[PDB]
C-alpha cells in the first residue's frame, strides 16, 4: 500500500494543510466571479479540468505519481437557474481515485464526503478572498478617497473591518478544529494499534470524525442556513463596493442582526460537555459579555 | 506568485537586512555559494517567496541596498555571504553617495538620480506577473534613511497602486541629544509619510532594545553589534506562514488585513520571548504550549516604550499570537481557552475583538525543532504615548530657535512644520475616539 | 483452573451475583465443611474469573503463562487417591491453591500500574493531602454556589476545579482531568452537598469497590467544610488586623475573646484530628506492602485502614457530630457579623453579637459535656486520646 | 495565589534579606543563574509562593530594596547571587540616596519621591490577582531604616486595606551610646507605627544576639558578618508550612491568626536551638522528637532580653512549636503529652491556652533530612520589660536636654514626644490587665 504517503497526499489536497493548493483555488475562485455567466459548451470541462492540473505546477509541489490520484469532475447545476452555467465556488469538486492495491482504504462513502469537504472549503475561501478583493478596490494611490470625511469612510470602514474581523476569526477556529486533532488521532493511532485488518471500517470512522469536527450540522440543522445568509450579505458587501452609502449602512446592520442571530442559535445547541466548537463559540460570548 | 521586493535603505536599514538574508540560508539548509545539503526541498516545501526563483539552484535575493554612506557596504564584501548578493542588481564595486548628513540631502537627491533609481529596481518587478508588494526596510534615525525614504513612499504609490506597502522601520534613540540634534525634525517628516503615503508600519523602538539587551543578554557596554540579533529573528518569524507551508494568512496581505482597524491606525506592537540558549537543556521534558502565551500579553517582551498605568482606559482590538515549530496542536485550543478567564487584553466596548493563533513547521534544525517560539503582533491603543513623546519633543525644540535658520536654506521655502503637527494630532485624537 | 463455573442447574454455592462479582449460597454449602472456608474458594475463584475477560497471560494461578497447573494436577491425583475424608489433609493444600496464587497477582499489579503512584494520589484527593491545591478551588466555588443547587452547577463547579488545578501547575497535566465533581437536588445550599468521582482503571478496581469510594467521598465533603470554615475564620479575622478598622470600644473587646476561643478551636480540633489520622495510618500501610507478599491480607488491612479514619472523624453519632456542626455554624455567623463596614461600632454589630456570645458558650459547655463521658470511660480509647489531646491543648 | 512582596529597607534590612534569598536557592535545589538539578520539582512541591512565577524556569525574587546608603548595594553586584536579582525592578546601576543620617530625612524624603516610590513596587502587585500581603523587612537601628519605614506603614494601610501586614524587624543595640545617640528617638517613633499602623511584628533583639553569638559559636571579636546567620534561617523556618507543602496554617494569615490575642499585643518571642555542626555525628542513632521541645519553653534559645524573675506573675497565652524535616510523627503526640505535667508555660487564669505543633518536610539535602529542627514562636506577657527598658531610656534623655534643639528644625513644629509615651504605656497597661 505504502499507505502513509497516500495518507499525507490526501491531507494536502482534500484537507488543505499545504495551503498553496487552496490559495491557488482562490485564483480559481478569482476566475468565476459570480454565477452564471460562464460557457455551457463541452469545451467548458476541457479547459477547466486542465487549469487545476496546471495549478499544481504553479505552486511547485509534488510529482506526477500522486497527481494521477487527483481528478476533477465538473458537475452541472443551474446558476441563472433556468439554464445551466455551472459554478466553481460550490460546483467544482475534486475526485480522489481508487487504484489497484489501495481499495481497503478508499470506498465510495468516503469519496462522497470528500466532495462534501472540498465544496465546503471552496465557499468559505470564496468569502475570505472576495472580502480581501474589496481592500484591493480601495487600495492606495488614492482610489475611493476621503480618509475620514466627506461622506462616511471613518465609520464605514469601522463596521467593515469588524465584519472582516468576525469572519477571519471564525474561519481560523473552524480550521483549527477540522485539521489538528484529526491528524493527531489518525496515522499514529492506526499504525501503532497493530490492528491492521479491514481498513475501511476504521478509515470511514476516521472520516466520520473528520466531518463531525467540521460543522457536521447532523447534515440537517439551521446552522447551514446561517452560513448561507452570512454568505448572502458578503455578495451584498462586495457589490456595493464595486459600485449607495445609505444602502450600505442598512446592509451591515442586517449583518449585525444575522450575527446576533448566529449567536442565539448557538445558545440553543448548548446541551453540556459536548461539541468542541460550542465552547469555542462560547469563548466569543464571554468576550461579548465583558465589553 | 507571491514575490516581495525588500527595499533596504539607510545606514541602519542595510545592516538589519544583511543578517536577515543571512538568517534565511541557515534555515533553508542552503549555502550562499552552493547547495551542499538535500534538506532544502524535502524539509522546506517553499523557498521562492522572498528569494528570486532559481536558474542553477542559486536562490538570488530580491534585494536592493542604497545608502549615502559607503561604510555599511564595505563591511559586506569581505564577508563570505556577499557572493550570494549580485554586483549587477544594485551597484558594482566602488559605489558611493553624498557627503553627507541631512534630511534635505536625500530628499533632493531623489529627483536628480530619478532616471537611475527607477531603472534597475523595476527589472525585478516584471520577473513575476503577480507582484505582492514592497517592503521599505529603511530607518528613521539619521538623515540618510529618513531623507531618501520619504521620496519613494510617494512615487511608488501611484506607479504601483495595486501593491501592498508595509515597512519594518526602526525608531531612533531618545536618550541624549548631543551627537544628533536633528532627530525631532527628520523623524516627524517621515512619520507623516508612514500614515497617508503608507498603509502599515511595524514599529521597532531603540530605547526598548537596551531594555531587553540588558534583561537576559548580560552586556556591560552596549554596541551596535547586538541590534541585528533581535531584529533579524522576528523578521523571519513574521514570514513563517509565508515562507514555510501554512494554510491561513499565508500571504503578507493575509496577516496585515486581519489586524488593521482603519488607515492611520496601523502601529503594531511586537513581542518575542525565547532568546536564551540555556533554556535548551530543560525543553526535553515536553514543555507545552499552555505557558508560552500567558506571558505574551504580560508586558515583558514588548518592544514599545509605553506607559504602565495607561492600559486601563486603552483597549486591545487585534492581537496575534504566532507559535512555530513543535506546537502539540491538541492543546492549542486549550491555550486559547484560558484567555477569556483572565481578560489580560482590554476589549473595545463598541465592537468585537480577536485573539488569532496560527502555526507553521520550522526549519529541520536542532535548535528549531526543539524549542517553542512565540511571535506577537499586537495592536493596542496606548501607542499615542510615543506620539505624545515625539510631539512634546518637537514643539519644545521650535521655541528654542533650533534648526530654523540652518534647515530652510535648501529646498524649503514655506513652514511645513505645523503640517506635520496637526496630522500627528489627528492620529492621536482618532485613536481615543475609536473606542466609543 | 480457568475460573469457569461448570454448572447447568446452578448446583454449586458459588453463583454469579471487568470484576464480575460472585456470591455464596448456604443451602448448597456442606455444613461439615467450615463456613469460613467457602469464600476462600469463591473470592479467589472470582478473581481468577476476571482475568479471563481482559487478557489470558494476566492470570492469577498461572494458566496460559506459568506451570502452576502441572503441580496443581499432581496435588489433584494425590487428593483423589483417598477413599476417606478429613479436615487437615483437605485444608493444608487449600493453602497451596491459594498462597502461590495470592502472590502472583501481587507481582502483576506492581509493574503494570506503578501501584505506589495512584494509591497515594487517590488518598490525596479524598483525605486532602494537597491542602493548598483545593483552597483555591474552594475560594472560587464559594462565589458561585451562592444559590440553591441546580443541575447545571455540577458542570460549572467542575470546570472551575479544572481551571483552579491548572493555574497551580500540577506536576502531571493528565492527573487533573482524571476526576470530575458531583453534587443534592436543592436543600438550601451547595456546600455540604457536593462530592467527587475519581473513577479507576483495570484491576485496581478490585481494591476499590464502588461502595467504598462513597466512604471516602463522605468525609471528603466534611474535610473541605473545615477548610472553608477555617479559611472563613481566617478572613473575617483578616478584616480587623489594623487599628483603622478596629474600634476601641468595649463592644469590640467582648467580640474579641470569642474568636480567641473559637478560631483557636478549628486550628486545633481539625488539625490534631486530621494530621494524626493521616500520619501513622499511612505509616503501617507503607510498612505492610513492603513486607508482605500476599493479596487479601494487604487488602483487608487497607479496609481496616479506612474504617479507622471514618471512626476517628465521626467521634459520636448524634451528639458530637451535632456539637461539631453547631460549632462551624456559630462561627460562620461570626464571619457575616464582622463582614459589615466598621462592625464593632454598629448597634446591629453588638445586637447580632449578643446571640453569638450565648451560642459560643453553648459549644464549649457542650464540649465540656463530652469530656465527662471521656473521663467516666467505657466507650472508646481512640475517641478519648484525641479529645483529651485537644483538651489539655485547650485547658492548658 | 499566595504571593507575598517583601519590603527590604534600610542598612540592616537589606543585608538580612540578601542572604534570605541566598538561603532559598540552596534548599530549592536551584542556582541563581540556571537550573542544573532536577531536585526542584520532585523534592519540592511548591516554589512560587515567595519567588515570582517562572517565565524560563527562572524564579525571580519578589523583592524591593531601597536605602539611602549606597554601601549596602555595592557589596551585592560582585557576589554571584545578584544576577538572580533584576536591575529593572528596583534600581539600575549607580543608585544613590541622601547624605545622610536622620529620622526626619527619610520621613521627609517619602513625599518628594512619592511618584516614583508608588510606581515600580505596584507593578508586582497586579501580577497575581489574589495578593497575600506585605512584609516590611526593615530595621529600627539608625535613621535610614526607621525614617522611611514609618511612611510606608501609613500610606499602604489605606491603599491596600485588605492585605496582611507583619514585619520581621530587628531591634537596635543598647550597650553604649557613643556612636549613635539618636537611638531612643527614632525607635519609639517607629514603634508607635508598629502597633496601630501595623498588625503584627516579629521582634529580634540585638543584645540577645551576642548572647547566642558567644554561647555556642565561639567568637572573640563580634563582627556584623554573624548577624545574617541567625536571622536568615528562622526567616525560611517561618515559611516551611508556606513554602513546603503543609496542610494547616500553610498561609501567613494562618500562622499569625492563631497567636495574636488582640491588636497592640503582637510581639512574638522567637526561639531556635540547632546551630552547631558537630551535632551531626550523633544524630545517626535516631535522635527523637521527645527531647527537642523540652528546651524550647526553657529560656535558653530566646532572642528577647527579659527578666528572669518576672515570669511568675506573667502567663503564656499562645505558644508555637514548629518541627521540621524528620519528625517521626508516631511520637509527636507523645511530645505534647509531657507538656501538661511540667506546666513550664504559665497559663492565663481567665481563658484557655494553646500549644500548637506542626510539621513539614524539609529540603532534599543531607544537613536538612538528618538533623531535627525546632522553631519557636512564643507569646509571653513579660515583653513589657523591653518596653520598660526603652521608656526609661526615653524620659531620662529628655531631661538632659538632648536633641530637643537639634531635631525640631526640619518638619517638626509641635511636641509629639508624649504622643509616643502614652501610647507605649497603653500597651504596657493593657498587657498586665489582660490576665484578670
Coordinates of C-alpha atoms in Angstrom, one line a residue, chain C residues 5-393:
Chain C
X5 CA -18.4 -22.2 36.6
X6 CA -19.3 -25.6 35.2
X7 CA -22.9 -25.8 36.3
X8 CA -26.1 -26.3 34.4
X9 CA -28.8 -26.3 37.2
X10 CA -26.5 -23.8 39.1
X11 CA -25.8 -26.7 41.6
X12 CA -23.0 -25.0 43.5
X13 CA -22.7 -22.5 46.3
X14 CA -20.7 -20.1 44.1
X15 CA -23.2 -18.2 41.9
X16 CA -22.8 -15.2 39.7
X17 CA -24.0 -12.3 41.8
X18 CA -14.0 -6.4 34.5
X19 CA -14.6 -7.6 38.0
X20 CA -17.9 -9.6 37.6
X21 CA -18.9 -10.2 41.2
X22 CA -19.9 -13.7 42.5
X23 CA -21.8 -14.7 45.6
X24 CA -22.4 -17.5 48.2
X25 CA -25.3 -19.9 48.8
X26 CA -25.9 -21.5 52.2
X27 CA -28.2 -24.4 51.0
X28 CA -25.6 -25.7 48.6
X29 CA -22.8 -25.5 51.2
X30 CA -21.9 -28.6 53.2
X31 CA -22.1 -27.9 56.9
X32 CA -19.2 -30.3 57.7
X33 CA -17.0 -28.1 55.5
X34 CA -16.4 -25.0 57.7
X35 CA -18.4 -21.9 56.7
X36 CA -15.4 -19.5 56.6
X37 CA -13.8 -21.8 54.0
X38 CA -16.4 -21.1 51.4
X39 CA -15.3 -17.7 50.4
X40 CA -11.6 -18.8 50.2
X41 CA -12.5 -20.8 47.1
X42 CA -15.2 -18.2 46.0
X43 CA -13.3 -15.0 46.1
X44 CA -10.0 -16.4 44.8
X45 CA -12.1 -18.2 42.2
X46 CA -13.9 -15.0 41.4
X47 CA -10.6 -13.2 40.9
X48 CA -9.3 -15.9 38.5
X49 CA -12.5 -15.5 36.6
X50 CA -12.0 -11.8 35.9
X51 CA -8.6 -12.4 34.2
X52 CA -10.5 -14.4 31.5
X53 CA -12.1 -11.1 30.4
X54 CA -9.2 -8.8 29.5
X55 CA -6.1 -10.9 28.8
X56 CA -5.2 -14.5 29.3
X57 CA -1.5 -14.0 30.2
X58 CA -2.6 -12.0 33.3
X59 CA -4.0 -15.0 35.2
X60 CA -3.7 -15.3 39.0
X61 CA -2.7 -19.0 39.2
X62 CA -0.6 -19.2 36.1
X63 CA -2.6 -20.9 33.5
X64 CA -1.5 -19.8 30.0
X65 CA 1.7 -18.2 31.2
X66 CA 3.1 -20.4 34.0
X67 CA 3.2 -24.0 35.0
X68 CA 1.3 -23.9 38.3
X69 CA -1.2 -26.2 36.6
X70 CA 1.0 -29.4 36.4
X71 CA 1.8 -29.1 40.2
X72 CA -2.0 -28.5 40.8
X73 CA -2.7 -31.7 38.8
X74 CA -0.2 -33.7 40.9
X75 CA -1.9 -32.4 44.0
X76 CA -5.3 -33.4 42.4
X77 CA -4.0 -37.0 41.8
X78 CA -2.9 -37.2 45.5
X79 CA -6.2 -35.8 46.8
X80 CA -8.2 -38.3 44.5
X81 CA -6.2 -41.3 45.7
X82 CA -8.1 -41.2 49.0
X83 CA -11.3 -43.1 49.9
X84 CA -11.8 -41.3 53.2
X85 CA -12.0 -37.6 54.2
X86 CA -10.6 -35.5 57.0
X87 CA -10.1 -31.8 57.7
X88 CA -6.3 -31.3 57.9
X89 CA -5.4 -33.0 54.6
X90 CA -8.1 -31.1 52.7
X91 CA -7.2 -27.7 54.2
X92 CA -3.4 -27.8 54.2
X93 CA -3.5 -28.0 50.4
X94 CA -6.1 -25.3 50.3
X95 CA -3.1 -23.2 51.2
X96 CA -1.3 -24.3 48.0
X97 CA -4.2 -23.5 45.7
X98 CA -4.4 -20.1 47.5
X99 CA -0.9 -18.9 48.6
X100 CA 1.1 -19.3 45.3
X101 CA -2.0 -17.8 43.6
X102 CA -2.2 -15.0 46.1
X103 CA 1.3 -13.8 45.3
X104 CA 1.4 -13.9 41.5
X105 CA -1.3 -11.2 41.2
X106 CA 0.6 -9.1 43.7
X107 CA 3.6 -9.4 41.3
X108 CA 1.2 -8.5 38.5
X109 CA -0.2 -5.1 39.5
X110 CA 3.1 -3.6 40.8
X111 CA 4.7 -3.4 37.3
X112 CA 1.6 -2.6 35.1
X113 CA 0.4 0.3 37.1
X114 CA 3.2 1.7 39.4
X115 CA 1.0 0.7 42.4
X116 CA 2.6 3.2 44.8
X117 CA 1.6 6.0 42.4
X118 CA -2.2 6.2 42.3
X119 CA -2.7 4.8 45.8
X120 CA -1.1 7.9 47.3
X121 CA -2.9 10.0 44.7
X122 CA -6.4 8.8 45.4
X123 CA -5.9 9.5 49.1
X124 CA -4.7 13.0 48.3
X125 CA -8.0 13.7 46.6
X126 CA -10.1 12.4 49.4
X127 CA -8.2 13.0 52.7
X128 CA -6.9 16.2 51.1
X129 CA -3.1 15.9 51.2
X130 CA -2.6 18.7 48.7
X131 CA -4.2 21.2 51.0
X132 CA -3.5 24.5 49.2
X133 CA -4.4 23.0 45.8
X134 CA -8.1 22.7 46.8
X135 CA -8.5 26.0 48.7
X136 CA -8.2 28.0 45.5
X137 CA -11.0 25.8 44.3
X138 CA -12.9 26.4 47.5
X139 CA -12.4 30.2 47.2
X140 CA -13.7 30.3 43.6
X141 CA -16.5 27.7 44.2
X142 CA -17.9 29.7 47.1
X143 CA -18.7 32.8 45.0
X144 CA -21.0 30.8 42.6
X145 CA -22.5 28.2 44.8
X146 CA -24.5 31.1 46.4
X147 CA -27.8 29.7 45.1
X148 CA -29.9 26.7 45.9
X149 CA -28.3 24.0 43.7
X150 CA -29.4 23.3 40.2
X151 CA -28.4 20.6 37.7
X152 CA -26.1 22.8 35.7
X153 CA -24.0 23.7 38.8
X154 CA -22.4 20.3 38.6
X155 CA -20.7 21.1 35.3
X156 CA -19.9 24.7 36.3
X157 CA -18.1 23.8 39.6
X158 CA -16.3 21.0 37.6
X159 CA -14.7 23.4 35.0
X160 CA -13.9 25.7 37.9
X161 CA -11.9 23.0 39.6
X162 CA -10.3 22.4 36.2
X163 CA -9.0 26.0 35.8
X164 CA -8.1 26.1 39.5
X165 CA -5.9 23.0 39.5
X166 CA -4.5 24.2 36.1
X167 CA -3.2 27.6 37.2
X168 CA -1.5 25.9 40.1
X169 CA 0.8 23.9 37.7
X170 CA 0.4 20.4 39.0
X171 CA 3.4 18.2 38.1
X172 CA 1.1 16.0 35.9
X173 CA -1.3 17.6 33.5
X174 CA -3.2 14.3 32.9
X175 CA -3.7 13.8 36.7
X176 CA -6.0 16.8 36.5
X177 CA -9.0 15.5 34.3
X178 CA -8.9 12.0 35.8
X179 CA -11.9 13.1 38.0
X180 CA -14.9 15.2 37.8
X181 CA -17.0 16.5 40.7
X182 CA -20.6 15.7 41.5
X183 CA -23.3 17.4 43.5
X184 CA -28.1 17.1 46.2
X185 CA -31.2 18.4 44.4
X186 CA -31.8 21.8 46.2
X187 CA -31.7 21.6 50.0
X188 CA -30.6 25.1 51.0
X189 CA -27.1 25.4 49.7
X190 CA -24.4 23.8 47.5
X191 CA -21.8 23.3 50.3
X192 CA -22.1 20.1 52.4
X193 CA -23.9 18.6 49.4
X194 CA -21.1 18.1 46.8
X195 CA -18.8 15.2 46.1
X196 CA -16.1 13.7 43.9
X197 CA -16.0 11.0 41.2
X198 CA -12.5 9.6 40.7
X199 CA -13.0 6.5 38.6
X200 CA -10.4 3.8 38.4
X201 CA -8.9 1.7 35.6
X202 CA -8.1 -2.0 35.3
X203 CA -7.6 -4.4 38.0
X204 CA -7.0 -1.7 40.8
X205 CA -10.9 -1.6 41.0
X206 CA -10.9 -4.9 42.9
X207 CA -9.2 -3.0 45.7
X208 CA -11.7 -0.1 45.3
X209 CA -15.3 -1.3 45.1
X210 CA -17.9 1.3 44.2
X211 CA -19.2 1.1 47.8
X212 CA -16.1 2.4 49.5
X213 CA -15.5 5.4 47.2
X214 CA -18.7 6.8 48.8
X215 CA -17.0 6.0 52.1
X216 CA -14.0 8.2 51.0
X217 CA -16.2 10.9 49.5
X218 CA -18.5 11.3 52.5
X219 CA -15.6 12.5 54.7
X220 CA -14.2 14.5 51.7
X221 CA -17.1 16.9 51.8
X222 CA -16.6 17.1 55.6
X223 CA -12.9 17.9 55.3
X224 CA -13.4 20.7 52.8
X225 CA -16.1 22.1 55.0
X226 CA -13.5 22.6 57.7
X227 CA -11.1 24.0 55.2
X228 CA -13.8 26.6 54.3
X229 CA -14.8 27.5 57.8
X230 CA -11.2 27.6 58.9
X231 CA -10.4 29.9 56.0
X232 CA -13.6 31.9 56.6
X233 CA -12.5 32.4 60.2
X234 CA -9.1 33.2 58.7
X235 CA -10.6 36.0 56.5
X236 CA -13.0 37.7 59.0
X237 CA -10.0 37.7 61.3
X238 CA -8.1 39.4 58.4
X239 CA -10.5 42.3 58.4
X240 CA -9.7 43.6 61.9
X241 CA -5.9 43.5 61.8
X242 CA -5.2 47.2 61.8
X243 CA -6.4 50.0 64.1
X244 CA -8.0 51.9 61.2
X245 CA -10.6 49.0 61.0
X246 CA -10.5 48.5 64.8
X247 CA -12.8 50.3 67.2
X248 CA -11.5 50.9 70.7
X249 CA -14.9 50.3 72.3
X250 CA -15.7 47.5 74.8
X251 CA -18.2 46.1 72.3
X252 CA -15.1 45.1 70.3
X253 CA -13.5 43.5 73.4
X254 CA -16.4 41.2 74.0
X255 CA -16.4 40.3 70.3
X256 CA -12.7 39.5 70.6
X257 CA -12.4 37.0 73.5
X258 CA -14.7 34.8 71.5
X259 CA -12.6 34.4 68.3
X260 CA -9.6 33.7 70.5
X261 CA -11.7 30.8 71.9
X262 CA -13.3 29.8 68.5
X263 CA -10.7 30.4 65.9
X264 CA -8.3 28.5 68.2
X265 CA -10.7 25.6 68.0
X266 CA -10.6 24.7 64.3
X267 CA -6.9 25.3 64.1
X268 CA -6.6 22.7 66.9
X269 CA -9.6 20.4 66.7
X270 CA -9.4 19.8 62.9
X271 CA -5.6 19.8 63.0
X272 CA -4.9 17.2 65.7
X273 CA -7.7 15.1 64.2
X274 CA -6.7 15.3 60.6
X275 CA -2.9 15.2 60.8
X276 CA -2.8 12.3 63.3
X277 CA -5.4 10.5 61.2
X278 CA -3.1 10.7 58.2
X279 CA 0.4 10.1 59.6
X280 CA 0.6 6.8 61.5
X281 CA -2.3 5.3 59.5
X282 CA -0.3 5.9 56.3
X283 CA 2.8 4.6 58.2
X284 CA 1.6 1.0 58.6
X285 CA 0.2 0.7 55.1
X286 CA 3.6 1.5 53.5
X287 CA 5.3 -0.9 56.0
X288 CA 2.9 -3.7 55.3
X289 CA 3.1 -3.6 51.5
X290 CA 6.9 -3.5 51.7
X291 CA 6.9 -6.6 53.9
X292 CA 4.1 -8.9 52.8
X293 CA 3.8 -10.9 49.5
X294 CA 0.1 -11.7 49.9
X295 CA -3.2 -10.3 48.5
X296 CA -6.2 -10.3 50.8
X297 CA -4.0 -9.7 53.9
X298 CA -2.8 -6.5 52.3
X299 CA -6.3 -5.8 51.0
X300 CA -8.4 -6.1 54.2
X301 CA -5.6 -4.2 56.1
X302 CA -6.5 -1.2 53.9
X303 CA -10.1 -2.0 54.8
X304 CA -9.1 -1.7 58.5
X305 CA -7.2 1.5 57.4
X306 CA -10.4 3.2 56.0
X307 CA -12.6 2.1 58.9
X308 CA -10.2 3.7 61.4
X309 CA -10.2 7.0 59.5
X310 CA -14.0 7.1 59.4
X311 CA -14.2 6.3 63.1
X312 CA -11.9 8.9 64.5
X313 CA -13.5 11.5 62.2
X314 CA -17.1 10.6 63.3
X315 CA -16.5 10.9 67.0
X316 CA -20.0 10.2 68.1
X317 CA -23.1 9.6 66.0
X318 CA -25.8 12.1 67.2
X319 CA -24.2 14.5 69.8
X320 CA -20.6 15.2 68.9
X321 CA -21.3 15.5 65.2
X322 CA -24.2 17.7 66.1
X323 CA -22.0 19.5 68.5
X324 CA -19.3 19.9 65.8
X325 CA -21.6 21.2 63.1
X326 CA -23.1 23.6 65.6
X327 CA -19.5 24.9 66.2
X328 CA -19.0 25.6 62.5
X329 CA -22.4 27.2 62.1
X330 CA -22.0 29.5 65.1
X331 CA -18.6 30.9 63.9
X332 CA -20.0 31.2 60.4
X333 CA -22.2 34.0 61.6
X334 CA -19.1 35.5 63.2
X335 CA -17.9 35.8 59.6
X336 CA -21.1 37.5 58.5
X337 CA -21.2 39.8 61.5
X338 CA -17.6 41.1 61.1
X339 CA -18.0 41.5 57.3
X340 CA -20.0 44.7 57.7
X341 CA -18.4 48.1 57.2
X342 CA -16.9 49.0 60.6
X343 CA -18.5 46.2 62.5
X344 CA -17.9 46.8 66.3
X345 CA -19.3 50.4 66.2
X346 CA -22.7 49.5 65.0
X347 CA -25.8 48.8 67.1
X348 CA -26.6 45.8 64.9
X349 CA -22.9 44.8 65.3
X350 CA -23.5 44.4 69.0
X351 CA -27.1 43.2 68.7
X352 CA -26.2 40.3 66.4
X353 CA -23.3 39.6 68.7
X354 CA -25.3 39.0 71.9
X355 CA -26.9 35.9 70.5
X356 CA -23.4 34.6 69.5
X357 CA -21.9 35.1 72.9
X358 CA -24.5 32.7 74.2
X359 CA -24.0 30.2 71.3
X360 CA -20.2 30.1 71.7
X361 CA -20.5 29.0 75.3
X362 CA -23.3 26.7 74.2
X363 CA -20.5 24.9 72.3
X364 CA -17.6 25.0 74.9
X365 CA -20.1 23.7 77.6
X366 CA -21.3 21.0 75.2
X367 CA -17.7 20.2 74.5
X368 CA -17.4 20.1 78.3
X369 CA -20.3 17.5 78.4
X370 CA -18.4 15.1 76.3
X371 CA -15.3 15.3 78.4
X372 CA -17.2 13.9 81.4
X373 CA -18.1 10.9 79.2
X374 CA -14.5 10.7 78.2
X375 CA -13.3 10.5 81.8
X376 CA -16.1 8.2 83.0
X377 CA -14.8 5.8 80.4
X378 CA -16.3 2.7 78.9
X379 CA -16.7 3.8 75.3
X380 CA -13.6 4.1 73.0
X381 CA -9.9 4.7 73.5
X382 CA -9.1 6.5 70.2
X383 CA -12.0 8.8 70.9
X384 CA -10.6 9.6 74.4
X385 CA -6.9 10.0 73.4
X386 CA -7.7 12.6 70.7
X387 CA -10.4 14.6 72.5
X388 CA -8.2 15.0 75.6
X389 CA -5.2 15.9 73.4
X390 CA -7.1 19.0 72.3
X391 CA -8.4 19.5 75.8
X392 CA -5.0 19.8 77.5
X393 CA -4.3 21.9 74.4

